[PDB]
Design a protein around this nucleic acid. Structure first.
Ligand SMILES: [Mg+2]
Ligand SMILES: [Mg+2]
Ligand SMILES: [Mg+2]
Ligand SMILES: [Mg+2]
Ligand SMILES: [Mg+2]
Ligand SMILES: [Mg+2]
Ligand SMILES: [Mg+2]
Ligand SMILES: [Mg+2]
Ligand SMILES: [Mg+2]
Ligand SMILES: [Mg+2]
Ligand SMILES: [Mg+2]
Ligand SMILES: [Mg+2]
Ligand SMILES: [Mg+2]
Ligand SMILES: [Mg+2]
Ligand SMILES: [Mg+2]
Ligand SMILES: [Mg+2]
Ligand SMILES: [Mg+2]
Ligand SMILES: [Mg+2]
Ligand SMILES: [Mg+2]
Ligand SMILES: [Mg+2]
Ligand SMILES: [Mg+2]
Ligand SMILES: [Mg+2]
Ligand SMILES: [Mg+2]
Ligand SMILES: [Mg+2]
Ligand SMILES: [Mg+2]
Ligand SMILES: [Mg+2]
Ligand SMILES: [Mg+2]
Ligand SMILES: [Mg+2]
Ligand SMILES: [Mg+2]
Ligand SMILES: [Mg+2]
Ligand SMILES: [Mg+2]
Ligand SMILES: [Mg+2]
Ligand SMILES: [Zn+2]
Lengths: 192, 136, 49, 79, 126, 59
RNA sequence: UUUCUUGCCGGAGGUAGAGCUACUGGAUGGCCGAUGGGCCCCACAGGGUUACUGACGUCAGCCAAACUCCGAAUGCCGGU
RNA sequence: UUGCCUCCUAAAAUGUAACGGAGGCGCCCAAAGGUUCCCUCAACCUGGACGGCAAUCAGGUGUUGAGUGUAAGUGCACAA
RNA sequence: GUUACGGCGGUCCAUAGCGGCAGGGAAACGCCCGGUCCCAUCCCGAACCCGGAAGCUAAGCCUGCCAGCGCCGAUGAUACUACCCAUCCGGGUGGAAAAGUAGGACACCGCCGAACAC
């Protein structure tokens, strides 16, 4: 299941620094860096609005097609430095990638469906590491809860993992734990 | 009340209350949380009141995580006394809160009730906070 | 005192050359050690005064 | 109503006394310290209270020798 | 496969010897004018080097594997005295009569003492 | 390339390395100016007192 | 001119910050599961069942003037 | 409370105040001084009559978490 | 000069460590055999010390390959900061981390000796 890369435009940062980054961030642009086996850390401003839009559409983990001054590159979002408060993305890290390339990544895990009513489902690890190709990276994968029995644990090793993707996390990492819903005489008994 | 079992030193200086919370700024345990916006000293009185507020509002089943601990003691010298004669005896306990730190976190099925319990807690705190969700 | 001041004197010339301390509880007898005598010119036994 | 503390001792003025590239006489003491934070290096001796001093005239220079910060005296050329 | 579990006496001998050597080395060293006479010793042979530690070089050397030394029908002390006189002659040729004795982490005595006293009488003052 | 430096502010309330940088530049009063070469020593010497002076190159 | 300023060069630090599975303490929630808890067959042997309490450990998020695997800017010493 | 010593305050040189925060000292050891040589602990697992986690024995893992007369700090496994 | 060699060293002493897999025994390095003699055990020829060459690559040593643990580690951003603006907010110019990422690394250099055509 190939995911189509998203087409952004970028242009080489003329000069570097906190003043330059603050100014660029002020003009609705995100400073970022390309690296990888391209062996050239290349400093690129890109459109903040388009960056946020594509991150909304295809999560944190999505291939991009960068147009660097006409040259055409394939990139993959490695990290995003984001402000804790203003929540704007400050910086981005872009591994260079090509087809048929396995890469390690972290994919969010969103529990889906309703559970049995007497107990609450609670996730400890929201993200699971997987090894997968550049184009075949899943932006999210689901875990099944449909009327479980009494409280039991779920680990990464029993998830319906996609095709062409490989678990990296040790299979005994807990993801979602159904824990019995606290009674009336049990909910306010902890916390002091 | 949340009180440390022992502190190595029982009379410290006032915690420096400047900067932005660098550690502990994300919601990880539950799905909704209360995330701070101002520097303050959250005493165990505030924490207990807020936790009881959340428990009263939801009242059925759901997990409340107080991921801040009041373990820093503020002392107070006895009343009617002049200046001098050394530092006082410690008599309340505090967590040092920066703008950015998720204070309380909640896990509960529905949305509106969870939001309302979180704002009920917020009203008991000496700061401005906001409700933050498990996703960016 | 239990660690009083004591003096050491050379036997062959009876000159008091050194003053030290020692424990009377642990060294009840006179302390004697081979020290250096400036006028005898060489190392000689020195005994407590 | 009283503080059960309020005593301290005199400052002993410890620390590095001659820094790198500084010409010294033979015998100048170069760093006062408690333990052996700086270990004696080439042509540098160590005193009774762990005071490092120069055993020859030259220029001070620091180094690391098998995970040990050391102080050495380098013979400057005679003009 | 038969995986051994213990430590061998070779390891303890080798590294304890090295530790004794280093403890010794904390206090002797070699210049150009007073070099260091370092000694190795095994169950078959005894080795000596004359070292200038300012460089990590060796100025003269000898062992009990040379033609003449293997030509001696005598005892290990005889090989030791031969090595001592040979290394003394080689040092004297190299232009040195003063040295410091690095006994090499072995206890001074036996064949090492025989070597050292042979060098002592042969012209090297130490 | 070389510069002209004109003093615009005064040295009342100025810290001591600022006043000494001004004195080292050879200028004493407000509106007084000097002309000098554009090396790194001058560039630093005016970097200290940029808030007190204004500079322009010649040509 | 030894003074002072600016540039460059040679230094020693443990502050701001940060980090803590790098120590000393605090400290949140999970996970497995003891030892010690109770019971059966029936012995106080032995075995397993059970809200057990749940050592240790481990996952994730944290905290410190008298914590530090780390760690600046300035200032300071010298030279030029 | 008044002299001395150690740490934090003390803002990475030194120094720095308050009826600021914590403790020690007014000794001890004829070896616990000098030198020469030799060795590596604490803890943990396994195997052993008393003997139990624990006492001494044996095997292993163990680079410093033990110890350093005596507060604290700086040191010390090259060993102090 | 060649060396699946032996020593003595050096390096802001792990980019060198730990672990794992596969080899070697020319001389060497070892283990190994014995306690007549120097010397030795707070008892023990186990260690140390002295003599010997029946057996060995099983170790130690060294060689080659593995990045699993430990180690090293940018660029960029950020924190913090000097100075300066600035009526609190905040900004500009210089310096710039820690953590993390890309990755690196199964050390390198030197001087003597051994055997080998010499
Ligand atoms: Mg501060
Ligand atoms: Mg945070
Ligand atoms: Mg932190
Ligand atoms: Mg409020
Ligand atoms: Mg006695
Ligand atoms: Mg002091
Ligand atoms: Mg001394
Ligand atoms: Mg003394
Ligand atoms: Mg064995
Ligand atoms: Mg200058
Ligand atoms: Mg400099
Ligand atoms: Mg430095
Ligand atoms: Mg300090
Ligand atoms: Mg801080
Ligand atoms: Mg503590
Ligand atoms: Mg600190
Ligand atoms: Mg200071
Ligand atoms: Mg300072
Ligand atoms: Mg003062
Ligand atoms: Mg007192
Ligand atoms: Mg002693
Ligand atoms: Mg003695
Ligand atoms: Mg043992
Ligand atoms: Mg390693
Ligand atoms: Mg062979
Ligand atoms: Mg024998
Ligand atoms: Mg082998
Ligand atoms: Mg070997
Ligand atoms: Mg490391
Ligand atoms: Mg950088
Ligand atoms: Mg304003
Ligand atoms: Mg880093
Ligand atoms: Zn006399």
């Amino acid at each position: 299941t190939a995911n189509i890369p998203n087409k952004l435009t970028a242009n080489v940062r003329t000069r570097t620094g906190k003043g330059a980054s603050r100014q660029a961030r002020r003009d609705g642009k995100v400073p970022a860096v390309l690296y990888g086996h391209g062996t050239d850390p290349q400093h690129l401003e890109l459109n903040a609005r388009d960056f946020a839009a594509v991150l909304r559409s295809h999560g944190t983990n999505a291939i991009l097609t960068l147009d660097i001054e006409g040259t055409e590159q394939l990139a993959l979002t490695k990290a995003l430095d984001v402000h804790p408060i203003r929540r704007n993305i400050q910086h981005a890290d872009l591994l260079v990638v090509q087809r048929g390339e396995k890469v390690t990544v972290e994919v969010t895990v969103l529990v889906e469906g309703d559970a049995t009513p007497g107990t609450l489902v609670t996730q400890d690890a929201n993200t699971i590491e997987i090894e997968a190709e550049a184009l075949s990276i899943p932006e999210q994968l689901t875990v099944s809860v449909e009327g479980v029995e009494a409280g039991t644990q779920i680990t990464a090793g029993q998830i319906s993992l996609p095709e062409g993707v490989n678990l990296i996390s040790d299979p005994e990492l807990l993801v979602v734990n159904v824990v019995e819903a606290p009674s009336a005489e049990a909910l306010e008994e902890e916390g002091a | 009340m949340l009180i440390p079992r022992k502190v190595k030193h029982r009379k410290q200086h006032h915690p420096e209350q400047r900067g932005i919370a660098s550690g502990g700024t994300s919601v990880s345990f539950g799905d909704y949380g209360i995330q701070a916006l101002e520097h303050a000293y959250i005493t165990n009185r505030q924490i207990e009141s807020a936790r009881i507020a959340i428990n009263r509002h939801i009242k059925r089943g759901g997990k409340v995580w107080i991921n801040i601990f009041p373990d820093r003691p503020l002392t107070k010298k006895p009343a009617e006394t002049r200046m001098g004669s050394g530092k006082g005896s410690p008599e309340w306990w505090v967590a040092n809160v920066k703008p950015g730190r998720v204070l309380f976190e909640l896990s509960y099925p529905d949305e509106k009730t969870a939001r309302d319990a979180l704002t009920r807690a917020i009203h008991k705190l000496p700061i401005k906070a906001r409700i933050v969700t498990r996703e960016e | 005192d239990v660690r009083p001041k004591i003096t050491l004197a050379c036997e062959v010339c009876k000159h008091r050359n050194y003053i030290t301390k020692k424990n009377r509880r642990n060294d009840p007898d006179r302390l004697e050690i081979k020290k250096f005598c400036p006028n005898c010119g060489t190392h000689q036994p020195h005994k407590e005064s | 109503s009283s503080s059960r503390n309020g005593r301290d001792s005199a400052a002993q003025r410890l620390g590095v006394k001659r820094f790198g590239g500084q010409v010294v006489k033979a015998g100048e003491i170069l760093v006062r310290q408690r333990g052996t934070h700086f270990h004696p290096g080439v042509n540098v001796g160590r005193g009774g209270d762990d005071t490092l001093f120069a055993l020859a005239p030259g220029a001070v220079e620091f180094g690391a020798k098998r995970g040990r910060k050391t102080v050495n005296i380098v013979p400057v050329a005679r003009p | 496969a038969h995986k051994p579990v213990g430590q061998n006496i070779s390891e303890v001998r080798r590294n304890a010897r090295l530790r004794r050597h280093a403890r010794l080395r904390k206090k002797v060293a070699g210049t150009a004018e007073v070099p260091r006479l370092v000694v190795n010793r095994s169950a078959r042979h005894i080795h000596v080097q004359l070292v200038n530690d300012l460089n990590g070089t060796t100025l003269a050397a000898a062992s009990s594997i040379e033609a003449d030394v293997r030509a001696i029908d005598g005892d290990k002390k005889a090989h030791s005295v031969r090595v001592g006189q040979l290394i003394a002659e080689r040092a004297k040729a190299a232009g040195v009569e003063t040295v410091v004795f690095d006994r090499g982490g072995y206890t001074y005595g036996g064949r090492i003492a025989a070597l050292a006293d042979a060098a002592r009488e042969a012209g090297l003052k130490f | 390339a070389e510069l002209k430096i004109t003093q615009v502010r005064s040295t009342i309330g100025a810290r001591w390395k600022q006043r000494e940088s001004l004195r080292t530049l050879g200028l004493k009063k407000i509106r007084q100016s000097v002309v000098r070469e554009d090396n790194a020593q001058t560039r630093g010497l005016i970097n200290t007192v940029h808030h007190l002076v204004e500079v322009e190159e010649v040509g």
